[PDB]
Structures are given as structure tokens and as C-alpha cells.
Scaffold this active site. Structure first.
Site, PDB file in Angstrom:
ATOM      1  CG  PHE A 190      47.023 -20.226  70.681  1.00  0.00           C
ATOM      2  CD1 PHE A 190      47.625 -20.790  71.109  1.00  0.00           C
ATOM      3  CD2 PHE A 190      47.433 -19.501  69.323  1.00  0.00           C
ATOM      4  CE1 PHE A 190      49.117 -21.808  70.751  1.00  0.00           C
ATOM      5  CE2 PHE A 190      48.759 -19.774  68.594  1.00  0.00           C
ATOM      6  CZ  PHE A 190      49.044 -21.502  69.416  1.00  0.00           C
TER       7      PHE A 190
ATOM      8  CG  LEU B 129      44.031 -24.369  68.172  1.00  0.00           C
ATOM      9  CD1 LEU B 129      42.998 -25.398  67.947  1.00  0.00           C
ATOM     10  CD2 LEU B 129      44.468 -23.010  66.825  1.00  0.00           C
ATOM     11  CG  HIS B 130      46.020 -25.110  74.743  1.00  0.00           C
ATOM     12  ND1 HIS B 130      47.405 -26.488  74.815  1.00  0.00           N
ATOM     13  CD2 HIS B 130      46.100 -25.279  76.023  1.00  0.00           C
ATOM     14  CE1 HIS B 130      47.190 -27.233  76.199  1.00  0.00           C
ATOM     15  NE2 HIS B 130      46.723 -25.824  77.170  1.00  0.00           N
ATOM     16  CD  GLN B 131      41.331 -27.618  77.756  1.00  0.00           C
ATOM     17  OE1 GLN B 131      41.195 -28.899  78.139  1.00  0.00           O
ATOM     18  NE2 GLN B 131      41.952 -26.533  79.155  1.00  0.00           N
TER      19      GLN B 131
END
Length: 187
Positions: free
Chosen positions: A25, A28-30
Site C-alpha cells: 500500500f 502504491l500510494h507513493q
RNA sequence: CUAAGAAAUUCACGGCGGGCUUGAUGUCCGCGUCUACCUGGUUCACUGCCGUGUAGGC
């Protein structure tokens, strides 16, 4: 959307699965903030809302081929061993109205006392007498460890799958926030 | 239905004093404690929109 990518984490004895879900996660966010696309949906199948644990699967929604290739690479940056992801296939269309979105709770009354004292209601001890007590501390079930980047600390993140009333399909934003803030087609 | 049937021992008192236990001595020699090892599931905070309360960002 019609560009779903199911990822099924391989069982590893050294690492618990949520400890790798947090890294997935975070990457994925970065790498989702890093791109130019703004609304990229994220859904959490295998949800299991009876034993209070997040699932072992994860799917994405991005209405392009180049963008879904960019996000096939993005969550898979550097790891290449723990994901064991799949292939983008043509989705079915039940769309049972399930919207996944962030929630936030307040369990630290001292931050509220700090905000009361040093920002608006300038006092010393009226704050500790008036509102807070060792009671009404909230809780939320699905946890994500989520170490921060821009001078932060370890803070949880809680998410909710909404009402699954199968009556119609209401249009919504694909994603509001880091991963998901709206409705997604649920399988 | 008994070798049956009955019953007041009661009073007092000075055990006293004396004393050298003495010397002597070689316990003594020896020694292999070895071997292996994931503390880990677990840092719900900081600060702000806001007069509460309850939205959001990382």
C-alpha cells in the site's frame, strides 16, 4: 472499470501478510501520487467482515492501457518476489453499489487539549476539566501500518466498504485520496 | 438381689561448712565438563475546519 489487476500474495513464513500489505500500500500510494492520473480506483476483495482482518487480495481500476501498465509497474517496483500478481482481464459487470472510503477516529484526547489550549480557547486548565475523560475512545477494524514520508510517524489507516444495496448504479468518483474514495465494481 | 448394707487422720519444723586437673604432638597425595539455537506478533500520532460535533491529509 475494465482494467482490473488482481494480486494474490504468496504465503511467506518469515513475514506476516499484513506486514507486506502495508509495504504494498505504501509503494502504491507513493507511485500513484507520482503519476499524472488523479482518479485511480482501488478495491479490496476477500474482505471477511466477521473476524476483523483485511484480505489477501487487491485490485486496481484505471481507464487506460498505458496508465494500467504504469500502475502494474508501480506497485511492483523493486519487490518482484512477494506480490505474485496477475494479468489485466475483461471485468464482469454486477456493480453492487459497494463504495470503499477512508474513515478517521479520535482516540487521543491530549491532541484535543493541545488544540483547545494553543489555538483558539487560550487557557491552562479549563481544557482538562471541560471535555475529555478516559471514555468514548473510538476504534476501527481494518488496520494498515503505513509509515510516513514527509517527517512523520507510524499512523494507522481505516477504510470502509459501503452499503451493498443491489438496486441501481450511482455514478461516483473513482478515487478520492491516496487509493480509494468512491464506488468500484465489486465481484 | 454383688465377703451385701455405713464411715472426716488431724496438726509443726534452719542441712550446714572447705578445696590447683596436669602436661606432648607433621594428614598427605592425583585429575579434560562437553554440545546446538529468529523476541516476535505490536509506535491508533500531529495539528487543523471548527464556538461544540464530525468532516479531511500524510
Amino acid at each position: 472499470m475494465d482494467h482490473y489487476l488482481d494480486i494474490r500474495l504468496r504465503p511467506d513464513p518469515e513475514f506476516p501478510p499484513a506486514q507486506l500489505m502495508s509495504v504494498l500500500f505504501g509503494k502504491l500510494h507513493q507511485a500513484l501520487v507520482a503519476q499524472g492520473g488523479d482518479r485511480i480506483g482501488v478495491s479490496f476483495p476477500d474482505l471477511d467482515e466477521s473476524r476483523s482482518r483485511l484480505g489477501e487480495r487487491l485490485r486496481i481500476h484505471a481507464s487506460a492501457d498505458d496508465l494500467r501498465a504504469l500502475l502494474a509497474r508501480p506497485w511492483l517496483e523493486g519487490l518482484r518476489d512477494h506480490l505474485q500478481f496477475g494479468e489485466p482481464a475483461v471485468v464482469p459487470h454486477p456493480t453492487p453499489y459497494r463504495q470503499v472510503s477512508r474513515v478517521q477516529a479520535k482516540s487521543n484526547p491530549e491532541r484535543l487539549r493541545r488544540r483547545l489550549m494553543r489555538r483558539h480557547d487560550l487557557s491552562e486548565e479549563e481544557a482538562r476539566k471541560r471535555i475529555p475523560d478516559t471514555v468514548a475512545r473510538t476504534l476501527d477494524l481494518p488496520f494498515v501500518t503505513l509509515r510516513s514520508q514527509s517527517t512523520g510517524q507510524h499512523f494507522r489507516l481505516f477504510i470502509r466498504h459501503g452499503p451493498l444495496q443491489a438496486t441501481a448504479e450511482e455514478g461516483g468518483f473513482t478515487c478520492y485520496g491516496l487509493s480509494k474514495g468512491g464506488f468500484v465494481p465489486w465481484f
